[PDB]
Amino acid sequence: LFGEPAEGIVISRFGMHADVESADGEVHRCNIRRTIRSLVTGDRVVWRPGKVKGIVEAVHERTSVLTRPVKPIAANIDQIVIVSAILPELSLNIIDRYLVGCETLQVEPLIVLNKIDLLDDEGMDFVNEQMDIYRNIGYRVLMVSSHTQDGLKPLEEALTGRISIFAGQSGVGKSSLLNALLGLQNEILTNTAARLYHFPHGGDVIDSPGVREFGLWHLEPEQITQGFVEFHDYLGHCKYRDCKHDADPGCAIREAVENGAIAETRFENYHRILESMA
Ligand SMILES: Nc1nc2c(ncn2[C@@H]2O[C@H](COP(=O)(O)OP(=O)(O)O)[C@H](O)[C@H]2O)c(=O)[nH]1
Ligand SMILES: [Mg+2]
Ligand SMILES: [Zn+2]
């Protein structure tokens, strides 16, 4: 016999159980109704307290769902923070692949360039010019340094009121940034393991090895194309209705690249991504 229903969010999925944070902040380890087809960290739930192990009664519809190449690992992500760094490698192709992933999942991306402390004036100007590629197509870019904490404040402001994950290649400083931001004292990131944490100034983050390894699954060409937001306005304006936007005569996208309206690396990476699929 249980009590009154209440809202909650899944902090972590214990395989057979789940730790649900109630709308009042208290965490309760709960069982899961057999009728629940799937429950993952980030799910918004209707639960009831036991009269101390409560029970999950239902799961609200997910605004988004993160999956592994097609099983859900996390739910209700609002923003994926794409983290890069000068070292070990600043890859525009990696960033572009992630952005395609964001557009496909329909979650807003946040491009973070970490380790700016490793650059001098000339280094800074170069990196900023690179990031302008992204600023110019509407994405917000943040220059930061975990070690110096520079730019960390605007990052917190961009994290508040949202549920994020930190995606990026190894060594860019994900664990470093998260530790600096979370200020954990009695927990440690795993440096079904996905767990959500609360940032001091608002907003949450779901983390674990798999989440950070957020990869791009098999996508159809059209999905890749939609994955480049600056392409949208040119679609339907190519000479051929079925223009593949490669060497096709009169391609509006390619010409835009040749005029400077679209960045060359974006077009180039668009094709590289297209190729690595099928
Ligand atoms: N110079 C510099 N080094 C950084 C910065 N942040 C992280 N590092 C170094 O980058 C390496 C990888 O950090 P890590 O958090 O493990 O990257 P991760 O694999 O994405 O979690 C070293 O462990 C960190 O000391 C930074 O802001 N500036
Ligand atoms: Mg603070
Ligand atoms: Zn075209």
UniProtKB/Swiss-Prot annotation:
Keywords tagged on the record: Cytoplasm, GTP-binding, Hydrolase, Metal-binding, Nucleotide-binding, Ribosome biogenesis, RNA-binding, rRNA-binding, Zinc
Superkingdom assignment: Bacteria
Pfam families reported for this sequence: RsgA_GTPase
EC number(s) recorded for this UniProt protein: 3.6.1.-
A molecular function (GO) term: GTP binding
Positions contributing to Zn(2+) binding: 238, 243, 245, 251
Cell compartment(s), UniProt: Cytoplasm
Cofactor(s) required for function per UniProt: Zn(2+)
Gene3D superfamilies in the record: Nucleic acid-binding proteins, P-loop containing nucleotide triphosphate hydrolases, Probable gtpase engc, domain 3
Enzyme type, top EC level: hydrolase
Family: Belongs to the TRAFAC class YlqF/YawG GTPase family. RsgA subfamily.
Self-association state and partner proteins as the record states: Monomer. Associates with 30S ribosomal subunit, binds 16S rRNA.
Matches recorded under PANTHER family: SMALL RIBOSOMAL SUBUNIT BIOGENESIS GTPASE RSGA, SMALL RIBOSOMAL SUBUNIT BIOGENESIS GTPASE RSGA 1, MITOCHONDRIAL-RELATED
Protein name per its UniProtKB record: Small ribosomal subunit biogenesis GTPase RsgA
Upper lineage: Bacteria, Pseudomonadati, Pseudomonadota, Gammaproteobacteria, Enterobacterales
